[PDB]
Every structure is written in C-alpha cells, then in structure tokens.
Design a binder for this molecule. Structure first.
Ligand SMILES: *SCc1cc(N[C@@H](C)CN)c2cc(C(=N)N)sc2c1
Ligand SMILES: *SCc1cc(N[C@@H](C)CN)c2cc(C(=N)N)sc2c1
Ligand SMILES: C[C@@H](CN)Nc1cc(CS)cc2sc(C(=N)N)cc12
Ligand SMILES: C[C@@H](CN)Nc1cc(CS)cc2sc(C(=N)N)cc12
Lengths: 10, 236, 236, 10
C-alpha cells in the first residue's frame, strides 16, 4: 500500500 | 455527551494519559469531549485529536482489509461458501468505521473548520476532512462512492490552495496534506499521474526550502519527505 | 445478551474471524455468546475463549500499570500534585478490568466448571478461575484483597490436585497451570520459596516425561517449560 | 515481571 502521513504534524 | 461534566483541562490531561496507556478509544472520547467545549484547539491539542482518531480508525481499517480479503476469497471460483458470517462481520466493522468517520467529520463541521482563524489550523482541519472522507471512500460502493470521493477531493483541494498561499513548502502540515492528497489520487481516484506529479513537485520544492530550517524543523519536514520518496518508488 | 439471536456455530466462526482481525473485544463478545448457548466447549473453543479475554484483560492490565506508575510518582516527595485526574483515570481502567474479570468468572461459575466432565476441561476452567482472581488481586487493596487472593489460591489448588492425579507431567494445561500458580506465589502471595519450589519440580518432572511425546506434543510442552526456566532465572 | 502462560494451551 501507499504511505500516508503520521497522525501528529508540527 | 458523557464528557460534558468534565473540565476541558482534565479531558486534555486524560487524553495524554490514555495515549501513554495506548487506550486510543478513551483518548478519542476525551478529545471529542474537549472539542465539544467549543474552544479552539491548540497545535498540541489538534495533534492529540488526530492521533486518537487515527489510531481508532486505523485498527478498523486493518480489520476491514483482513475481513474483505477473506470475503473476496470465499467468493472465488471453486471456493466453497461458508454462509453469511464473513460478510456480516465485515459489514459490522464497516459500520463502526463509518460511525467513527461520521463523528470526526461532525466535529470538523460543528464547528472546527469555520472557527479556524489561522492557515495552520484551517489547513489541518481541512486535511482531516479529506482524510476521513477518504476512509469512507475506501469502503464505499453504490451510488454514493463518487460523491464521497468528491467530498474528499474538495476538502483536500481547498487545503492545498491555502497551504500554497500561506505556508512554506517545508511546513509539516503542508507536506502531510500533499502526501495524503497524492495517496487519494493514487489509491482512491484512479489518478496515478496526478499522484506522481504531486509527490515529485512536493518533494523537490521542500528539498529547496530545507536550508531555511532549524535542526528541529528540518527533522519534522524530512520525515514526511521520505514518505513521499517511498511512495514514488512504489508508483514509478 | 446481544448474542442471543446468533447461532452458536456463527459465533465461533466470527470469534475466529475477529482473532484474525485482532479485534479481541469482538472476539470476547462472540465467545461469551457461544458459552451462553449452554453447550460444553471443545478444546479449540476453550482456547478461543481464553485468547479473547486474555488479550482484552492484558491491555487493561498494561494500561493500569502505566497509570499506577504515573500515580505513584505524582505522590512522591517533592512531586507536585496535578489534581485528581491520574487517580480518576486509573480508577476507570481498574473498574473496567474488574468488570471483565467478573464477566469471565461468571461464565466459569454459570456453568462451565460444574459441567466440565473431563480432567482437561475442568483443570482448564479452574486454572482460568485462578487467573482471573489473580488479575483482580493485582489491583485489590482494602479488606477484600486477602479474600480475593485466597479465592485464586483455592482455584489453583483444586486444579493442581486434579492435574497431578489425571494428567502427565508434560500436559500443556498442567504445565501452564503450574507456571501460573508459581507466578501467583511469587507476585501475589509473597511466597517466593513456594514459587521457586513449584517451578523447579514442574520443570524437572516434565523434562523426564518428554521422551514419551511426539514431536508435535514435545513442542507444546517445551514452550511452557522455557517460561518456567526464564522465571527461575529471575527469581534465583 | 514474571512470565505467565500464553493464552492458548493444547
Ligand atoms: S503542534 C506542537 C506539537 C508537536 C508534536 N510533535 C509532532 C509534530 C512530532 N512528534 C506533538 C505530538 C503530540 C502527541 N502525540 N502527544 S502533541 C504535539 C504538539
Ligand atoms: S485444543 C486444540 C487447539 C490447540 C491450539 N494450539 C495451541 C495449544 C498452540 N498454538 C489452538 C489455538 C487456537 C487459536 N488461537 N485460534 S484454537 C486451538 C485448539
Ligand atoms: C454522501 C457522503 C458525502 N457526500 N455522505 C456520507 C456517507 C456515508 C456512508 S453511510 C457516511 C457519512 S458520515 C458524513 C458526515 N459529513 N458526517 C457523511 C457521510
Ligand atoms: C471478594 C471477592 C471474592 N472473594 N469478590 C470480588 C471482588 C471484586 C472487586 S470489586 C470483583 C469481583 S468479580 C467476582 C465474581 N466471582 N464474579 C468476585 C469479585
């Protein structure tokens, strides 16, 4: 599968 | 809501405790309660909200994929039919996943997005709206799939417009937005060329902005850049 | 119960699906429903029951330990007091853990233990009764701690008596019983000498019975034997 | 901590 963003973002 | 009687600060404190305890269902309920207090969320609190629900829905998505695979194989040629149980249970998980998406989308629409008075907060929430319509799209089929997909597109696209006007190319929210929109394009909207083009432009423009960052910011930006690179390797 | 309208076979099928999906709360609800059909459980079904609830209560125990540690440090000398929130949330998790133990113990007492017509089934259920009283003991304090501990002891001891009369020393249920009773002795009942003595005797007597086993049975027995050995290394 | 038995037992 494709990677999506981690949940926490600065 | 059952969190109505608890103080906002206590809910945030307990969300952080639940995260330490890996109790993500609790964490999501605490953060829902905090949102429903009606005050704007800080950057940290927005991340707590996202972590909680992303973990909750992530477990549901992983289960749905396991079950959907089983179901597809019990429907292959020569594969006996073990009755309704696989479909039933996949439908149960699907419905619970849909309820979580509905809950998050409801928080964003009442009233996080409209009250978001910063580019960073408004992009964060619009990205989340796109993400949770995407999770609905992953399990959608009949006659509403197309409209769910376009709701995800509309949300991502507005977030993209703001982020490009208001944030630098290395901004981690801008980067995670572009990553997730590229995954939308590739996996949901059958637009692999758009996905590739977006991931390439996103990576290259961020690479050229790294020199402006502190070591702390450089670390956050490059983590997401590597995900863009990893996808481009899969897709090309 | 909400599982009353579902067929026994469908509940078992769905418990197995939930295990594949790592949906252990679902798995436990399905197996509770299957037990409440009133028929005896097979060896496989007993294991499904145990896996479901052990995973559910294991997550609760891990959370309780995280939270209890936080709580103990916010009560150390010079450590500021952040209000009631840590205690409250530890109490919430504790109460949920206690409810799970109550539910399992209720299934065993109505009527799994009394209807268990084999040594292997009766020992399995009595070991489980001891285990779930032990989990209650881990969080017990005032004036009921001692009685909960002795309920765990009484259950383990009856299981031990049957297993020694009726099963060979390598029987995996006998071995896992002895392991867990030794952990009871060491961690709950402040009886480290009993724990060590039991683990040593259990290991040595099993070692001398391995030659009677097939490769399949030998594998099951030696896995638990290594846990006995690992504990003896910690304890001596 | 001490190790206790795995959930499934043959
Ligand atoms: S908005 C400031 C902020 C940053 C982070 N860190 C991520 C961007 C990288 N780890 C953050 C993490 C939180 C958590 N998961 N408890 S809250 C928060 C806030
Ligand atoms: S009672 C026959 C039986 C044996 C096992 N295996 C364990 C003893 C070792 N893996 C078993 C595992 C089950 C599961 N977790 N789905 S059910 C079952 C039955
Ligand atoms: C048609 C589509 C949006 N165009 N709507 C939805 C469909 C499903 C599948 S049952 C769940 C939800 S949850 C939700 C919300 N905004 N809270 C909207 C929807
Ligand atoms: C005093 C002790 C047994 N001697 N009883 C219990 C105490 C607690 C802590 S609130 C929970 C449960 S659940 C349960 C059962 N058999 N279902 C018994 C108990």
């Amino acid at each position: 599968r494709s990677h999506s963003s981690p949940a926490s973002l600065q | 809501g059952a969190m109505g009687s608890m103080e906002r600060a206590s809910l945030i404190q307990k969300a952080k405790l639940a995260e330490q305890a890996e109790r993500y269902e609790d964490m999501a309920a605490f953060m829902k309660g905090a949102v429903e207090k009606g005050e704007e969320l800080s950057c940290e609190e927005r991340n707590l909200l996202s972590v909680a629900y992303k973990n909750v829905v992530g477990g549901q998505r992983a289960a749905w994929r396991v079950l959907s695979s089983i179901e597809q194989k019990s429907n292959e040629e020569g594969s006996e039919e073990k009755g309704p149980e696989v479909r039933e249970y996949r439908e149960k998980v699907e419905t619970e996943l849909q309820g979580v998406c509905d809950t998050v989308l409801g928080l964003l629409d009442s009233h996080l997005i409209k009250e978001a008075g910063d580019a960073e907060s408004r992009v964060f929430y619009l990205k989340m709206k796109g993400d949770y319509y995407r999770y609905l799209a992953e399990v959608a089929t009949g006659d509403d799939k197309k409209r769910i997909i376009d709701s995800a597109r509309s949300a991502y696209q507005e977030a993209m417009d703001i982020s490009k006007k208001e944030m630098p190319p290395t901004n981690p929210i801008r980067l995670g937005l572009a990553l997730n929109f590229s995954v939308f394009h590739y996996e949901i909207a059958n637009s692999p060329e758009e996905a590739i083009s977006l991931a390439k432009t996103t990576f290259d423009e961020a690479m050229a902005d790294l020199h402006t960052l502190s070591e702390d910011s450089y670390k956050d930006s490059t983590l997401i850049m590597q995900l863009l690179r990893d996808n481009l390797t899969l897709w090309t």
